[PDB]
Design a protein around this ligand. Structure first.
Ligand SMILES: Cc1ncc(COP(=O)(O)O)c(CNC(=O)C(=O)O)c1O
Ligand SMILES: Cc1ncc(COP(=O)(O)O)c(CNC(=O)C(=O)O)c1O
Ligand SMILES: Cc1ncc(COP(=O)(O)O)c(CNC(=O)C(=O)O)c1O
Ligand SMILES: Cc1ncc(COP(=O)(O)O)c(CNC(=O)C(=O)O)c1O
Lengths: 395, 395, 391, 391
C-alpha cells in the first residue's frame, strides 16, 4: 500500500459511463419504483433482476450497481451484497448459509455483536456455535464437526488485535471440510490490505462504516463472495430485505477514492504511536499488527500489504472508575466514541474483566486497562502530547 | 381522514426542540461514532442506549429518534423499529418472535416476499408456516396450533385487496392463544387509516417506502409495537443489525407532513376511477376496499377512516402476451413499475395463474387479467382518458 | 390539466434513467470523451448539454424544463435563493443611466437591493402604488428599463391590475423589461408570461420546496429576454446545487394538492377574521373587499395560504409578547410556503418605513399569517386563544 | 499543526450535537419562541445566532468558523460557487467611478465579470503583469479601490511577489481593498491575510470539496472589510445550501493528506516533463525556473496538483484529437482539485485572448494537467503514450 499499487484502481473502481453519465462520480438514483417502458423490458429486467438490470429499488439502482462493481474489482469477488451496517452484513451473511442442525465455528476475538448474533439469535434457531483461539492455526482441524457449516474469521481480532495465520486455518478447513463456508470480517484491512478471497476464504465482510466511508458519518455493510457462494448470499440476504440506500452507496464509492492516501497516513501515524507506547514506562503491552512482537505480527508481515490506524495497548495498571474518568474525560484531541476508521482520533477503554467476558471459553492474559486507539489524520506529535498528558493524569 | 382530524398531528409529530434545534424539521445527524464527553456520559448513554440517548449510530441519532417518536404517536405504540425497507421490516419482525419449533399463521393474500421469507428462510430454521383465507374471520380459531407463535395479517391484501374482519380474527386468536403475537402489514393504510394497535394487534409493520415517503424515491420499513412486544422486537432486530440511514429517516418524517392532503386526493381519485371501471363493459370485477361490493368492504367501512389510492380490477378476458404488450406498452400517463404510494400513477398486470401461484392452498375465483392501479395526483379525467385508450387497444 | 402537468413536468428518460424522479448528478467537472464532444458541449453549454457544473447537470436541466413548461417560458435561470433571483434578474438588465420602476409593496430585500446596490452603480429606482394600473404610464421616463411588479404585494397583499399596467407600459416603452415576483402564486396560480410580463421570478424556497427546508430562486423568461438573463446571471456565478434542484422538482409534484388546501384553509380563516370584533381589516387576495380582489378573481386560478390582517388596536410591547409568545400551533419565523402555520407582527410605522414615498392607511398592529396544512379548526382555536390574551 | 487544525476546525458541540461532524440543518424558516428571542436573533443575525436560512443554519456557522480559523479571518461569506464568490466579493466593494486593478492572469470568468458586468456599471478595470511586483505602485490611480491578485495565475501558473505588491499598494493607497483568488493553495498553502491581503477568495469547488461533486465559493475577510463584504453579498442573496456546506467542512478533514499527495505526484510529473524532449517549458510553481518560483518557495508551505506545460510544437487539429482523445487515465474536463487527473489544451492565441493588453511568450500548444490521486507511474505512462501519438 505504501508503494501505492492500488491508488489507480481505487480512483477508477466502479466508474463506467452507464453509471457516471458524464460526471466523475456515479449519479445518485433514488428509487423504489423502476419503470419498465414495455412488457419486453419488464421481462428482461425480471430475468436479470440480480444481474445489474434496473428492476426494483430493493435490488438496487445505478448507484448501487456502481458500488457493487467497485467492491468486486477491489476484493476480487463474483458479487457484492449491501447491508444497512456492518453488523447487518455479519448477521445476514452467516444466516444466509445456515439451517437448523448446523454448527458455526467462530474466533473468540470476533466483534461482540457478531458473537451475540450467534449466541442469541442462531442458538434458538437450532444452529450451535463453537469457538477458537485466534492463533490456533492448523489445529483448528480438531474443532471441525461433521455439521460445521461456517468457519468465521476476524483478523486482526476486535480490540485485542491478534492476527490469524489464515493460510494455515484455510488449509486445515479444506482438508477436513472442503465444502465449509469460510468467512472473514475484513474491516480492519478495509478489504484491500488483506486480499481475503485470494487466500481461499469464500466471503469477505466489511463494516464499510469504517474506512470505506472514512468520515464517521455513514453506516453500511458489504459482503463480497466468490462464485461458489454468491447466489446463495445474494438471494438469501434479499429474502431478509437487506439493502443500503442509494446516497450511502454513493458516499461509499466516494470514500474509496481517498482510501489509499488515508490508509498510508493511518499506518504511518499509528505505528509511530505504537513504537512510542512500546517504550513507555506506563505501558505493559502494545497490540498493533505492524509492531514486531505483537500477536500474529509475523502473519501480518507476510499476508498484508499495509496497516490501518486501529490498535490497542495495555496500561501498567487497571484504572479504577475514578482514574478512568481522570484519564478519559480530559483528552484534548482524542474523542471517546465507538467505531473507528475516520479522520478523527478516538479512544475507548475496556477493563480486563470486560474483555474476558467477551472471550468465550478463554481467559485474558493481561491485568491492566486496555486502551483502544484509532489514530486519525491529526499531526502525530499533537496526538503524542495528548497521550502524554493522559499518562501524567494517572501516574 | 376526509374530516382532516389527523392533519395537525401529522404536521407536528416528532417535532420537539431537542431534534429541530430552531428549524421546522429535525436536523439530519449523520453518524456512526457518537461522542461521550465523559465516562459518566458514556455510562448514562449505555444504560439508555435503547431509550433515546445518543450512544451509537446503529441505535440511532437525533434524526431517527424524531421519526420514532412521530411513528409511536401516530400509530399509538410503545416503540418503533426502523429497517432498510418494508421487506426487511416484515422478515425481521417475524424473525424477532420465532424460534425452532414455532408455527406462523399467515394470510394467503400476504405480499409475496413475506410469503417467500416464510417458506424459504423460516422453514429451514425449524419454523413452519400455515395459511388462511383473508375472509376467514372468527373461523381462524380452528387453524391455531399449540405452537402457533405469530398470526400475520395484511388488510387489504396484496394485489387482490381483500379486507380482513380484524375484530373477529383478533377475538378468536385471543380466545385460543392469548399470548400469540398478532402482526399486520398496514402499508396500504399508511398506518393511519387503520389504527391497528387499537384493535388489539401487537405490531403494525409498514413499507414506509409507500405513502410515508410518498415520492417513489426512498426505501424504509417501520414496525410499531405495543408495550408487551417492544423490547423483544427492538433488541432482536438490533442483533440483526437493522437500521435505516439518517437521511431517509428525515425524508420519512418529512413525508408525514403532507400525508393527509395526499391520502385524501388518492381516495377521491381512486374511488372515482373504481366507480367508472365498475360500470365498464370490459371489466369483470373491481377490487377497491372503498367500493361497495368489494370483498371485505363492510369491514373497511366500519374499521378504516379513509382509503389510499391502490386497487385492482379484473378484465373481461385474459390478455395474451401480445395483447398485454399492446395494452401496457402504450399508456401515456400511467407508468409500469413495482411499488406504489407516490405522486405518479402506476399500472401492473398479473395473470390469473400468476396470482393462483401466490395464493397458497387456494385457487383464484377469476379468469381475466388482473390490473393493479396506483392512482396518483394527476387529474382524474386525464387518467380516465388514458384507461379508455387502453381499453380501445384490447377491445 | 395543472395536476397532470405538475406530476410530469421535466420528467424525460434522459434525466430519470429508469426512475420516477430525475437522477441527482453532483458535478463540477463534466467529462468530454473527445475534442469533438467538447466542441459540441461548448456550443450547447446553455442548451442542456453537459458542459460544466456551473451551467448545470442533468438534475438542473430537468428542473429547468419543468419550470419552462409550467410557466410558459423560453428558459429558466436558477439561483441560491429568491433574493438572489430578484437581485440578479434585475441586475442582468440594467446599466449606468437606467431607471427601474418598482411597486412600493415589493419585498423589503428587493427594495434594499435597489437602494443599497443599484443606486451607487448608477441605476435609479422610482416607486409606484400597487393599484396605479394604467396611470403607471405617467411614471415611465426616457431611461426606464425595468418595471418590477409583485402581486400580491409583500405583507399587505395588494393585487395589481397586471393587464392595465402591462398595456400602459407597452404603449410608452414597448421594449421595457417587465418582471414580477410571482412567489405567492408559486408561478402557477398566475400565468405571468401569458399576461405579457417578460420574466417571472420566484423564491422557490416557498411553495415549490413546500417544506421550509430548502432555499432556491428561479427566473423564467420569454424568448426575447432569455439570453441576456441566462448569460448575465451566469457572469455573476448564479446557480443552485443539484440536490436542491432535485428537491424543487420533487416539490412540484405535490404543489397542486398542497395549494388547494392552503387556499381552502386560508380563505376560511380570512372569512372568520373578517367577522371578528377584534379585527379591523383582512388583507387576503381572495377575500371580497381586499385591495385588488377583483383582479385576483379575474386573473388568478387560485390562492395560496399567506395573508395578513390588522387588529382593532395597536398592541403595546407587553400585549405583543402576551399575544405572540403563547401560540400553540402557529410558529414565529420568517418565510412561508410550507406545511407549518406561521405568524409575524408589524407595527404600522414598520410598514410605512418599507413603503417608499408612501404612508400606510391603518393604525392597528398588522399580523401576517401563513396558513399551513394543520386542521383549520385547530388553527382557528389557536387564533381565538390569542385574541383572548389581548382583548 | 495544520493537520490537527483541519481535523478540528469548526467542530464545537453546539454544531455537532454529539456526532463527529456538524449536523445538517436544512432550513429557510428559523423559529423564535418569543418576541425577545426574535429581537436577540435579529441583533445577532450575522453573528452565528439562528435568524433566517439565507444568513445560515448551524451547518453554515460551523463551516464559517472553520474557514475563519484556517485562513485567519474575521468572517467568511459563502456563495453558490467560486465564480459567484469572485464576482460578488468584488461587487461588494465598488461603486460608479471606482477602478479595479487585476492581474492579467486572472481566471477568465473573473475578467469577464469585470469587462461585461462592472464596466457598464461605471467601474473600470486595468490590468497588470503578474511579475510586476513593486512596480504596481505606478498603476494605482486616485480612484483605485480594489487590487485583485491570483497567485499562481490561471492556466499559466505565474506566482506573484505578494509582499512586494502589498507594500507598494499600501505606500500609495493604504485603504485599498486587496483581494486574492487563493483557490490553488486551498487557502492553506498560502496564508493570504498574514501577508496583508484583505480578502482571500476560494472556489471551494476545487480542493476543499476535493471530489469534483460539489460547488461552493468562500471569501474570508479581515476585520476592516468583513462587515461590508457580509452585508453587500447578502443584499445580492448570496448563500450556499446546508448540505454543500457540510460537504465542504467534511472535505477539510482530508485536505492535508490529499494536498501532500497532489504535491508529491505533480512535482514528480513536472520534473519528468521538464526533461522530456517533446516539452518546451513546464509551468509549475514548485519547479525551479518557473515564473515566480522563488516566491512560491519563500511564501507558500506546499503545492497542490494543478500545473501546465508547453509542447515543443503547435499541434494541428488532427494531432490535438490524436493526443487528447486517447488518454486512458486523464479525463478531459473543466475544474480541478479532485481525485481524478484531468487534461485540457489551449493554443497560444487562446491564452493571448485572455491576457488583456498582453501577448504570450510561447508558440507551442499548452497542456494543463490536474494531477489527482492515481499512482504517479501510471500517470507518467499515460503521458508517455500521449507523447508517442504526436511525436
Ligand atoms: C470489526 C467490526 N465489524 C463490524 C462492526 C459493525 O459495523 P456497524 O457499526 O454495524 O456498521 C464493527 C464496528 N465497530 C465498532 O463500532 C467498534 O469497534 O467500536 C467492527 O469493529
Ligand atoms: C404490502 C407491502 N408490504 C411490503 C412491501 C415491501 O416494501 P419494500 O419494497 O421492501 O420497501 C411492499 C412492496 N410493494 C411492492 O413493491 C409492490 O406491491 O409492487 C408491499 O406492497
Ligand atoms: C415575495 C418574496 N420574494 C422573495 C423572497 C426571498 O426568498 P429567499 O428567502 O431569498 O429564498 C421572499 C421571502 N420571504 C420571506 O422570507 C418573508 O416574507 O418572511 C418573498 O416573500
Ligand atoms: C482560480 C479559479 N477561481 C475560480 C473558479 C471558479 O469556481 P467555480 O467553478 O465557479 O466553483 C475556478 C474554476 N476553475 C475551472 O473551472 C477551470 O480552471 O477549469 C478557478 O480555477
Amino acid at each position: 500500500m505504501a508503494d501505492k499499487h492500488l491508488d489507480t484502481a481505487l480512483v477508477n473502481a466502479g466508474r463506467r459511463k452507464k453509471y457516471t453519465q458524464g460526471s466523475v462520480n456515479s449519479v445518485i438514483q433514488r428509487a423504489s419504483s423502476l419503470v419498465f417502458d414495455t412488457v419486453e423490458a419488464k421481462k428482461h429486467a425480471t430475468r436479470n433482476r440480480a444481474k445489474g438490470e434496473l428492476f426494483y429499488g430493493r435490488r438496487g439502482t445505478l448507484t448501487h450497481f456502481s458500488l457493487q462493481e467497485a467492491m468486486c474489482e477491489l476484493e476480487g469477488g463474483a458479487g457484492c451484497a449491501l447491508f444497512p451496517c456492518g453488523a447487518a452484513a455479519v448477521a445476514n451473511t452467516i444466516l444466509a448459509f445456515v439451517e437448523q442442525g448446523d454448527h458455526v465455528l467462530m474466533t473468540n476475538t470476533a466483534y461482540e455483536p457478531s458473537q451475540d448474533f450467534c449466541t442469541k439469535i442462531l442458538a434458538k434457531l437450532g444452529v450451535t456455535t463453537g469457538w477458537f483461539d485466534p492463533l490456533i492455526g492448523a489445529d483448528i482441524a480438531n474443532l471441525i464437526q461433521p455439521n460445521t457449516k461456517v468457519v468465521f474469521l476476524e483478523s486482526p481480532g476486535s480490540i485485542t488485535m491478534e492476527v490469524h495465520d489464515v493460510p494455515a486455518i484455510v488449509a486445515a478447513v479444506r482438508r477436513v471440510a472442503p465444502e465449509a463456508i469460510i468467512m472473514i470480517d475484513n474491516t480492519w484491512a478495509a478489504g484491500v490490505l488483506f486480499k481475503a478471497l485470494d487466500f481461499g476464504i469464500d466471503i469477505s465482510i466489511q463494516a464499510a462504516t469504517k474506512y470505506l466511508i472514512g468520515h464517521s458519518d455513514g453506516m453500511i455493510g458489504t459482503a463480497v463472495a466468490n462464485a461458489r457462494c454468491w447466489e446463495q448470499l445474494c438471494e438469501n440476504a434479499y429474502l431478509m430485505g437487506q439493502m443500503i440506500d442509494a446516497d450511502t452507496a454513493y458516499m461509499t464509492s466516494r470514500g474509496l477514492r481517498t482510501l489509499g492516501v488515508r490508509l498510508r497516513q493511518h499506518h504511518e501515524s499509528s505505528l509511530r504511536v505504537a513504537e512510542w507506547l512500546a517504550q513507555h514506562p506506563q505501558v505493559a503491552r502494545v497490540n498493533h499488527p505492524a509492531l514486531p512482537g505483537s500477536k500474529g505480527h509475523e502473519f501480518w508481515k507476510r499476508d498484508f500489504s499495509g496497516s490501518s490506524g486501529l490498535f490497542s495497548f495495555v496500561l501498567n495498571k487497571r484504572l479504577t472508575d475514578a482514574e478512568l474518568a481522570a484519564y478519559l474525560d480530559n483528552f484534548s484531541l482524542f474523542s471517546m466514541a465507538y467505531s473507528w476508521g475516520g479522520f478523527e482520533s478516538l479512544i475507548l477503554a475496556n477493563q480486563p474483566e470486560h474483555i474476558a467476558a467477551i472471550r468465550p471459553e478463554a481467559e485474558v492474559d493481561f491485568s491492566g486497562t486496555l486502551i483502544r486507539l484509532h489514530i486519525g489524520l491529526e499531526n502525530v506529535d499533537d496526538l503524542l502530547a495528548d497521550l502524554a498528558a493522559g499518562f501524567a493524569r494517572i501516574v
